[PDB]
C-alpha cells in the first residue's frame, strides 16, 4: 500500500515532501498514460457547503476520467443539514456509509478535520476548509510551478493580494517551504498580511522572506507571481476598507520580468489582473487550472488504490 492509501488529505502541514512528490509523480504518468477504469467500482461523495466552479468541476470531472461515480450536493441549502437543522457530524456519519470517499468544502475552519472524526475508514479530501487549508489546490500549483520552472526548489515566489484569508497561500507557502532554497515576497495590505504562524514556520526552517508595498519591486527577480483575490466573503466588517483589490497587474507591468516567469492565480479574479494579461506568454492561470484534472485525478488514484499506479 502506497504512502497515501486510504489517508485523509486535510492539511499540507500534515504531509511530507515525499507525499507531495509522489502525487506529482502519479500526476505525471496519469497525464501521459490515462486509466479510464482505474476507479471503476467506486462512488465518491462531492460535498460542497460553499460556492465553487473550478474545485468542484475539475474535482468531479477527475473522478469520471477514472471511471468513478459521483453523488453529492453543491448547495447545503437543500440538504438535511440545511432545512431540518442537522449536524455536520451526523451528516458525515451517514454519508460515510454510502460512499468510499468524501470530498468536502465548507465555509468554516476545521470542517475537514472534524469530518475525519466521524467518517470511519473513509478518506476525507478537504476541498476547502473555509479560509484555512486547501491541499488539492496546492498540488495544482506545484504540478504547475514544476511544469513551468523545471524544479520546485530555488525559486523566487511572490504571493500578492489577500494573504490573511487566502487559504491557497497558506498551503502553498507551507508546501514550497518543504523544498530547499525558496525565497518569498509577501505583498499585501497590512490589515490582511501573511499570518504569523506561517512566518514563524518559515523562520523555524530558516526560509528567506521579505515584505514589499508594490509589484515593480520584485518583478525583475520573481519566477512565480502568485496573484490572489481578496476574500470578501470572509472579511470582517472592520476590514471592508480592503474590499477592493489594492494591487493590480497590467500587461505593461511585466516589461522587465524574467523569461521563465509565469503568473499564477487560482481563478476567481476581479481586476487584480487586467484582462490584457491573458495575451502575454507569462499568463498561466488558466493553463494551471487545467492541471487540476491531473493533480486531482492523481490524488484520487492515490487514496483509493492500495496498488501503486503505473
Query: Which partner, a second copy, other proteins, none, binds residue 264 by CB below 5 to 8 Å per kind?
Result: none
Q: DSSP readout, 126-186? A: EEEETTS--HHHHHHHHHHHHHHHS-SSSEEEEEES--SS-HHHHHHHHHHTTSSSEEEEE
- Annotated binding residue at 268? yes
Is 134 annotated in a binding site? The answer is: yes
Q: Reply yes or no on whether 164 is catalytic.
A: no
String marking each residue 160-199 x if it binds other proteins according to CB under 8 A? -----------------------------------xxx--
Identify the residue among 31, 113, 250, 258 touching other proteins (CB under 8 A): 113
Contact (Cβ atoms closer than 8 angstroms) between residue 72 and residue 45:
yes
Is position 71 an interface residue for other proteins (rule: CB under 8 A)?
Answer: no
* CA neighbor of 62 nearest in space, from 97, 99, 103: 103
Q: How far apart are CA 71 and CA 106, in angstroms?
A: 17
Residues 6+ apart with CB under 8 A from 159: 166, 169, 172, 173, 184, 185, 186, 187, 194, 226, 228
Verify binding: residue 91, a second copy, rule CB under 8 A. yes
Task: Decide if 159 contacts 169 (C-beta within 8 A).
Answer: yes
Catalytic residue among 7, 31, 54, 113: 54
Task: Candidates 38, 47, 68, 88: give the one binding other proteins (CB under 8 A).
Answer: 88
138 flagged as catalytic: no
The answer to whether 300 is a known ligand-binding residue is no
**Which residue's entry shows cell 526548489?**
153
Contact of residue 216 among other proteins, a second copy, none (CB under 5-8 Å per partner type): none
SS3 307: coil
Considering only CA atoms, give the Rg of the chain: 19
CB neighbourhood size of 98 (10 A) = 11
| Residues between 234 and 253 with contacts to a second copy, criterion CB under 8 A | 237-241, 243-244
Residues 141, 228, 260: CA angle, nearest 5 degrees: 50
Whether residue 249 is annotated as binding a ligand: the answer is no
105 is an annotated ligand-binding site residue = yes
Does 54 engage in binding with a second copy (CB under 8 A)? yes
Q: Could you give the CA distance from residue 76 to residue 12 in angstroms, rounded to a whole number?
A: 26
Binding segment (CB under 8 A) for other proteins, from list 71-79, 125-133, 138-146, 155-163: 125-133
Do residues 302 and 2 lie in contact, with contact meaning Cβ atoms separated by under 8 Å? yes
Residue ranges in 217-236 that form contacts with a second copy under rule CB under 8 A? 229, 232-233
**Annotation-wise, does 280 bind a ligand?**
no
For residue 133, which phi and psi values (nearest 5 degrees)? -85, 165
Binding footprint of a second copy on the chain (CB under 8 A)? 36, 41, 43, 45, 48, 50-54, 57-58, 60-61, 64-65, 69-75, 77-86, 89-91, 93-95, 97-99, 191, 229, 232-233, 237-241, 243-244, 267-270, 275, 286-287, 289-290, 292-293
Binding footprint of other proteins on the chain (CB under 8 A)? 11, 13, 87-89, 106-111, 113-114, 117, 129-133, 195-197, 200, 234, 236, 275
By annotation, the residues acting in catalysis are 54-55, 84, 105, 134
| Binding-site positions for carbamoyl phosphate | 54-55, 105, 134, 137, 267-268
Amino acid at each position: 500500500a502506497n504512502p497515501l492509501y486510504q489517508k485523509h488529505i486535510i492539511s499540507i502541514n500534515d504531509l511530507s515532501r515525499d507525499d507531495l512528490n509522489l502525487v506529482l509523480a502519479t500526476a505525471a504518468k496519469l497525464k501521459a498514460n490515462p486509466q479510464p477504469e482505474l476507479l471503476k467500482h467506486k462512488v465518491i461523495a462531492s460535498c460542497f457547503f460553499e460556492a465553487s466552479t473550478r474545485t468542484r468541476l475539475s474535482f468531479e470531472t477527475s473522478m469520471h476520467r477514472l471511471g468513478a461515480s459521483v453523488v453529492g450536493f453543491s448547495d447545503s441549502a437543500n440538504t438535511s443539514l440545511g432545512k431540518k437543522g442537522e449536524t455536520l457530524a451526523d451528516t458525515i456519519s451517514v454519508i460515510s456509509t454510502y460512499v468510499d470517499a468524501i470530498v468536502m468544502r465548507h465555509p468554516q475552519e476545521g470542517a475537514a478535520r472534524l469530518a475525519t472524526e466521524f467518517s470511519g475508514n473513509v478518506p476525507v479530501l478537504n476541498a476547502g476548509d473555509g479560509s484555512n487549508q486547501h491541499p488539492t489546490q496546492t498540488l495544482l500549483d506545484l504540478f504547475t510551478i514544476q511544469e513551468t520552472q523545471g524544479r520546485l526548489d530555488n525559486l523566487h515566489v511572490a504571493m500578492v493580494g489577500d494573504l490573511k484569508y487566502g487559504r491557497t497561500v497558506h498551503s502553498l507557502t507551507q508546501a514550497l517551504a518543504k523544498f530547499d532554497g525558496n525565497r518569498f515576497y509577501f505583498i499585501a495590505p497590512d490589515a490582511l498580511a501573511m499570518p504569523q504562524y506561517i512566518l514563524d514556520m518559515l523562520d523555524e526552517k530558516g526560509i528567506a522572506w521579505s515584505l514589499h508595498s508594490s509589484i515593480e519591486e520584485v518583478m525583475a527577480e520573481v519566477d512565480i507571481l502568485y496573484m490572489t483575490r481578496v476574500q470578501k466573503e470572509r472579511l470582517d466588517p472592520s476590514e471592508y476598507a480592503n474590499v477592493k483589490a489594492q494591487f493590480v497587474l497590467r500587461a505593461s507591468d511585466l516589461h522587465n520580468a524574467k523569461a521563465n516567469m509565469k503568473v499564477l492565480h487560482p481563478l476567481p479574479r476581479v481586476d487584480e489582473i487586467a484582462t490584457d494579461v491573458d495575451k502575454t506568454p507569462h499568463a498561466w492561470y488558466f493553463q494551471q487550472a487545467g492541471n487540476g484534472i491531473f493533480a486531482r485525478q492523481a490524488l484520487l488514484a492515490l487514496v483509493l488504490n492500495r496498488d501503486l499506479v503505473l
